[PDB]
Amino acid sequence: MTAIREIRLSEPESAQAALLALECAQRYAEPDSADFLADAAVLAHDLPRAVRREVERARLDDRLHALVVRGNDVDQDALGPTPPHWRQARTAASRRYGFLLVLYASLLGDVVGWATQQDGRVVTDVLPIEGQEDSLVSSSSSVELGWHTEDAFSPYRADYVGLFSLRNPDSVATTVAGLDPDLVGPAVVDVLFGERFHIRPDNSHLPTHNSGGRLSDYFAGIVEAVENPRAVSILRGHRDAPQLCVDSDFTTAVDGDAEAAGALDTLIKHLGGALYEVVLGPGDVAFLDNRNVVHGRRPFRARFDGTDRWLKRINVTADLRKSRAARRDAQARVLGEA
Amino acid sequence: HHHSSGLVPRGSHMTAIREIRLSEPESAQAALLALECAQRYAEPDSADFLADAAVLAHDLPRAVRREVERARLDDRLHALVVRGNDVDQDALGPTPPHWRQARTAASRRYGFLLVLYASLLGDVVGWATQQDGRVVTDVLPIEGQEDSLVSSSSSVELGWHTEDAFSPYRADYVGLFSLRNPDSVATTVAGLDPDLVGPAVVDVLFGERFHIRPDNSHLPSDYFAGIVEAVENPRAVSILRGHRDAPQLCVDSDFTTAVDGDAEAAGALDTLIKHLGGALYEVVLGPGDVAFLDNRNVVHGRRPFRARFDGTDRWLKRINVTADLRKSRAARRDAQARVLGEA
Ligand SMILES: O=C(O)CCC(=O)C(=O)O
Ligand SMILES: [Fe+3]
Numbered sequence: 318m319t320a321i322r323e324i325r326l327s328e329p330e331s332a333q334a335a336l337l338a339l340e341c342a343q344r345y346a347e348p349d350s351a352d353f354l355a356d357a358a359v360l361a362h363d364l365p366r367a368v369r370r371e372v373e374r375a376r377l378d379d380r381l382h383a384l385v386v387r388g389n390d391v392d393q394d395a396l397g398p399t400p401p402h403w404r405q406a407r408t409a410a411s412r413r414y415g416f417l418l419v420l421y422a423s424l425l426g427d428v429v430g431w432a433t434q435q436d437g438r439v440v441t442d443v444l445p446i447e448g449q450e451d452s453l454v455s456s457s458s459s460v461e462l463g464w465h466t467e468d469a470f471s472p473y474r475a476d477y478v479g480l481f482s483l484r485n486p487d488s489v490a491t492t493v494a495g496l497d498p499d500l501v502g503p504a505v506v507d508v509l510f511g512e513r514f515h516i517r518p519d520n521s522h523l524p525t526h527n528s529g530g531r532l533s534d535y536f537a538g539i540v541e542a543v544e545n546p547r548a549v550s551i552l553r554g555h556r557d558a559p560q561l562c563v564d565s566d567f568t569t570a571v572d573g574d575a576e577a578a579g580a581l582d583t584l585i586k587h588l589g590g591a592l593y594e595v596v597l598g599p600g601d602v603a604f605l606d607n608r609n610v611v612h613g614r615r616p617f618r619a620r621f622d623g624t625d626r627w628l629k630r631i632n633v634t635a636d637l638r639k640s641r642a643a644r645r646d647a648q649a650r651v652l653g654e655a
Numbered sequence: 656h657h658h659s660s661g662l663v664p665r666g667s668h669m670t671a672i673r674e675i676r677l678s679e680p681e682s683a684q685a686a687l688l689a690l691e692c693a694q695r696y697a698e699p700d701s702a703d704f705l706a707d708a709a710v711l712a713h714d715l716p717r718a719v720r721r722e723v724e725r726a727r728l729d730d731r732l733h734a735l736v737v738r739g740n741d742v743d744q745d746a747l748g749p750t751p752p753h754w755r756q757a758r759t760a761a762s763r764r765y766g767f768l769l770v771l772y773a774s775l776l777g778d779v780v781g782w783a784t785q786q787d788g789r790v791v792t793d794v795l796p797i798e799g800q801e802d803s804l805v806s807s808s809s810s811v812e813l814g815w816h817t818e819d820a821f822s823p824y825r826a827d828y829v830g831l832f833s834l835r836n837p838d839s840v841a842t843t844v845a846g847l848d849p850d851l852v853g854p855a856v857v858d859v860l861f862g863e864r865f866h867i868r869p870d871n872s873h874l875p876s877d878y879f880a881g882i883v884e885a886v887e888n889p890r891a892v893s894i895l896r897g898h899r900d901a902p903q904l905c906v907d908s909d910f911t912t913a914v915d916g917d918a919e920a921a922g923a924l925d926t927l928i929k930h931l932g933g934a935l936y937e938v939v940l941g942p943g944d945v946a947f948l949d950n951r952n953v954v955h956g957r958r959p960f961r962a963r964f965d966g967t968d969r970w971l972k973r974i975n976v977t978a979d980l981r982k983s984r985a986a987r988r989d990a991q992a993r994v995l996g997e998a
Contacts, residue, residue, distance in 0.1 A: 355728070359720050362713035373710045377778075379981060379990040420699045427728075476981070555985040608981060636979040638730060638827070639950065641898045655898060 320382040322375045322497065322597065325480065326389060330365040331600070333418065337363050338417035346408070347414030349439035351648055354428065362425040372424040379558045381606040382493050383602040384425075389417060391483055392511035398623025399484065400445050403435050403456065406442035406530065411483065411629070416441040418481040418629045421602050425477050427637035431468070432653035439650050443480070443628040445619035454521045455567055455614070455630070462493055463615035464592055465564035469516045470542050473640040473652050474562070475632035477604040478612065480500045482597035483627040490594030490606040496552070496561050501587055506552060508580035510559070514544035517567040538643075538653050551584065560601040560608040565589070588635035597628065604633065656739075660722045662692040665936050667848050668733060672938070673726045677739035678712030681716040682943070684685035686741040689713050690766035699766030700779065700790035700992050712774040723775045730901045730997035732949040733846055735774060740832055742941035749966025750795050750835065754786050754807070762834065762972070766791035769832040769972045772945055776828050778980035781997035784873050790993050794831070804909070805872065808957065815843055815935065816955030818948075818975070820907040821869040821885050824983040824995050826975035827957065828947040834970040841937030843956040844948065847895070849906050852930055859923035860895040861902070867892055868910045869968070878986055878996045894927065903951040908933070918934070940971070947976065 326334065341360060345353035360367070368386065375384035392412065400406040418440060422428050430439040446456035457463060480491065498506045520526065522539045548571055552559040565585060570578035588611055597603055603618035605612050619625045636641065641647070645654040656679040663672035664895035677685065692711060704711075713720070726735040742765065749778065751757040758766075769791060773779050780791040797807035806813065820827035831842065849857055866889035873882050891914050897900040908928055913920035931954055940946055948955050962968050977983065984990070988998040 340793060355725070356721075358727075359717070360722050362720065366710075369713065370707070370711050375708065377706065377991060379984055393965075439918070553986075558984055558990065635981060636827075637728065638978055642732055643899050644898075646902060 318624065320380060321376060322371060322378070322381065322383070323385045323387060324368055324371040324494055326365070327447060329392050331369060331388050332367050333419060335413070336652040337420060338413045341416040341420065342413045342561065345381070345416070348412060348419050349428070349430070349545065349650070351417070353416070353633045354439070354650060355648060357419050357423040357428070361420045361602045362419060364404070364424065365446055368422050369424060372421070375581070375604070376425050382495055382596060383593065383606065385463070385603045386421060386602040387426055387598070387600070388601060389431065389481070391600045393484065393599065396483060398456050399625040399627045400442070401621065402446055403442040403444065404595065406444060414483055414629050418602065419629050420481055420606070422477070422479045422631045422633045425604055426633045426635045427650070428632050429475065429537045429632045429637065429640065429652055431522065432651050433440035433527065433539045433634070436528050436531060437651040437654065441629065441630040443622070443630050445625050450619070453519065454526055454539065458498045458617050458619040461616045463565040464494060464611040464613040465566070466562045466611055468498055468547070469562050469564040469567065470650070474645055475607045476635040477633035479578075479630040479631040479633055480597055481600045483629065484599050485626045486624060488596045488598070489617040489626050490590040490596050490615045492615060493595055493608050493610050494588045494591040495590070496559070496584070498556065498559060501583060505580045505583050506559075508576050509552040511577065511649060512548045512550050513571050513574050514549055514551055514581065515569045515571060516549055516564055517546055518542050518561065519564060519567050543645070551581070554588070561611065563611060565611070573632050658718050660881070664889050665733065665785070666934065667850055668731060668846055670729050670731055671733040671846065673720055673722065673729065673735045674724045675734060675737045677716070677719065682739050682741050683718060684716050684848060685768060685771070686764070689750065689764045689802065690706045690929060692771065692808055697768050700781070700993065704767070704770070705779065706991065708770050708774040708779070715771060715775065720775060723772070726972045727776050728946070731952065731986060733844055733953045735947040735948070736936050736938065737945045738941070738943070739946060740768060740936040744942065744944040745888040747834060749968040751793070752964065753797055753926045754793040754795065757989060758789070759941060760987065761769055765832050765834055765972050769830055769945065769974055771977045773828070773947070773974050775831045776843045777978045778993070779956040780824070780977050780980065780983065780993045780995055781973070782952045783971045783994050784875070788994035788997055792973045793900070794973050796968050798964045801962065806957070809960055810961035813957035813960055814909045815845065815931065815954045816907040817905045817954055818945040820905050820910065821873070824977070824986055825905070826950045827978045828976040829950050830976060831940060831946045832949060832972040833942055833944045834967045835942050835967070838960060838969070839941070840969050841939045841954060841958055842948070843935045845931040845934040845936070845940055846953045847902070847927070847931070848934065849902070851934070852926065856923045857895065859920055860927060862920065863891045863893050863994055864914050864917050864920035865892055865924065866912050866914065867896055868904065868909060870910060870911045878968065878998065894924070895990070897947045904954065906954060908954070936957065
């Protein structure tokens, strides 16, 4: 209904947001520099008032699918070519969009990264990588990004996933679905509320999607969660507004629970059909409510000529304090550094 | 009457107290925002105001917002104290004789300001079983409840505790806005210094070896069934939680016991009760002073004091703040409602 909340920036609101981002770029080294992240929540208060009003309505809407902020300024000429790999995507020209993504995000909560994702960067990159066309990770193209709750396996999974589209010349859709409980059956719902499923870390948490020199110890937690998954529910909270936690490629029923394996089969067919498209054009920022929706990305053909689709991505928590056991120190934002 | 802020240590807790002193212009700016809110919105906890409160709070003085944000992310904070807000004592009128008479037109602006400060730290919540589910509550002495074990006490020690220690929906912060305090009556505060306790005791306190039962406050429904089960069939819980370097504390000096037959846990618990009792210090809020206690880090209580019941007694506005409103949705009526156990 209001499941998708959209704000289209006026030209002045777009210009004001860009100016704030560019002041941040002048002051701080990286969009996830510790001194910037300490200051971000209060810097975000200087974003346009009309934007702050609508973000706050989104934040307290427990039936949100996504907040979409359209029409941020992106200078395509100044940005330069789409990097061929996330490792090379921390470009001088792309800093300003990282800073703006963190400012928007800091209206919804606190930004976090993962020790086991893109070398523990808090601002990450989504771009097609040659040789990953058919992979199950966000650098895919030819094969759909299978729908998932972000970091479904983890009790420290984000409350919001933020995406800042820098470029999307072929209008490739982000896919989104919620679960209408009164639509699969209060029978299947009860089975999904039961701690009767295994959810494993997706392939982006593997050493193979990180730099080779990363501490083996960062991946201890990921390997444990692959080998010995905890028995967990797919639904939780109030029955009038249950939260969703499932990954289409990394969820199984606990072996010998055909009632569970039956409900999961049913959920996977349902959500696959229910998946709807949101197209993020250049300058469009989305925050997906990761408690309410699964998301993915349509298949596309990458041209690998520097013109390809490029997003900046961020994880947002409503409650940074709750993850302190998994972080190095109070201010550190990288889950699994502890 | 210049802006200042700093860190006041207590024992080995180097950032225990974060103190902010408003300049006259910062005081006036906060007061004008609160007064504008009181003109535009029904109540300090009406749906119209709470939907906007987190954004209206961005209009508080910038220097105060930066220092509050530093407090919010300080996982070793005991108390954030903001001193020097305007209270017009003449216009406020006498301290009401009961909380049921305390939601006065004259005191609205102080409820609004408490919610604005609170909304810099998180989202305000109340409890169906406390002061009729009001989010902005009143702390004042009630004639005939001098010997009481609730915040309306005076002659008797309010025994110290984590706020709502039994509950998974317990506040992350307890906020207090002092309207008057002529006799400088204190809130007592204590955190755990792991350096003053045997590591073996600390190891036991991290164990799920304890029962934390609700005060009789709670108790009257799927919510209230959970309260009865919390008294009769209490879950086994830990007292310390999270990172060894920055553990959260959850204990109630009157309502915590070790699990049946766990003498070692009974020993660790009473070692902790003696430690916190010995480590208690005091925070006094003068008129216009606001405090947020980090309920994840400290227990709090109150010393004996002498109430006059003549309209001059100590009066605070009080609020519960959560870092994560969404996690309590099963215990609230609808998305925007802030009253725990209202559904
Ligand atoms: O490319 C997209 O639109 C989605 C990316 C994504 O889901 C992700 O990287 O987590
Ligand atoms: Fe994703």
